[PDB]
């Protein structure tokens, strides 16, 4: 059997969208940390498992679980991890990642082990997301507007309106957009309060050009985000990921 997603899985997942390093999961027994890097359609993720106790974990078994569609879109390769984890020890695995095509689902990391006479079972969403393959595209205003207008089919645009989770801090917002994988294009939207971005999603089989506009209303503490891309599922996925960052 598999544990349901741990409390805070979704909140924490959201912290690994625009950055690669952090603690993915921690309770009284176990700390799971991540460090990753991506280039083009590839990635390398280190997953670290720390035994916070003085007792060995036995039959320690981390498994990367991917839905059928996800497996066709995203190749994850990793090696056996030794099933014994000494008390106070930190062990690790390397996950080599290859994006074959655009994808919407996330892998689930399930960890099971014996701890003394107990059985432990933890499930968390693993932050391998489409924007990890999103790389910035610098371009002039004129070219941006040309490209924006070429993506005028209704299904190519996805929008969200949401309450700011964080202070609407101009410099941090810029940094988050860059961390998402977008270029930050200055003086495109004539309103200097707004943010405009462009990038390309790199997959083995295809590349997708994506444009975005983020419009803050500081008085109202809300944003409107617009994505345009040539693929409806890509517009949806990037819009929903990026929406949770501000």
């Amino acid at each position: 059997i598999l544990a349901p997603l741990a409390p805070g899985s979704e909140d924490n997942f959201a912290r690994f969208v625009c950055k690669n390093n952090g603690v993915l999961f921690e309770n009284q027994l176990l700390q799971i940390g991540l460090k990753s890097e991506f280039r083009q359609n590839l990635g390398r993720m280190f997953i670290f498992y720390g035994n916070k106790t003085s007792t060995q974990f036995l039959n320690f078994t981390p498994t990367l679980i991917c839905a059928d569609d996800l497996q066709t879109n995203l190749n994850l390769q990793t090696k056996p991890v030794d099933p014994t984890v000494d008390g106070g020890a930190q062990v690790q695995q390397v996950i080599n990642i290859e994006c074959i095509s655009d994808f919407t689902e996330a892998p689930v990391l399930n960890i099971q082990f014996r701890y003394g006479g107990t059985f432990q079972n933890v499930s968390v969403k693993l932050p391998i997301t489409l924007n990890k393959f999103f790389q910035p595209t610098e371009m002039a205003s004129q070219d941006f507007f040309q490209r924006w207008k070429q993506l005028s089919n209704p299904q190519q645009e996805v929008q969200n309106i949401f309450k700011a989770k964080h202070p609407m801090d101009t410099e941090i917002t810029k940094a988050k957009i860059i961390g998402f994988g977008s270029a930050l294009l200055e003086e495109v939207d004539p309103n200097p309060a707004n943010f405009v971005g462009a990038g390309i999603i790199h997959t083995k089989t295809t590349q997708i050009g994506c444009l975005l506009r983020l419009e803050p209303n500081l008085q109202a503490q809300m944003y409107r985000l617009t994505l345009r891309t040539s693929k409806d599922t890509v517009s949806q996925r990037l819009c929903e990921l990026l929406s949770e960052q501000f």
């Binding site: 924006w148 309106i161 939207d189 309103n191 309060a193 506009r213 419009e215 209303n217 944003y223 409107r224 617009t226």
Partner: peptide, 7 residues
Amino acid sequence: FEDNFVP
């Protein structure tokens, strides 16, 4: 752009 979030 076609319209603006903030009038």
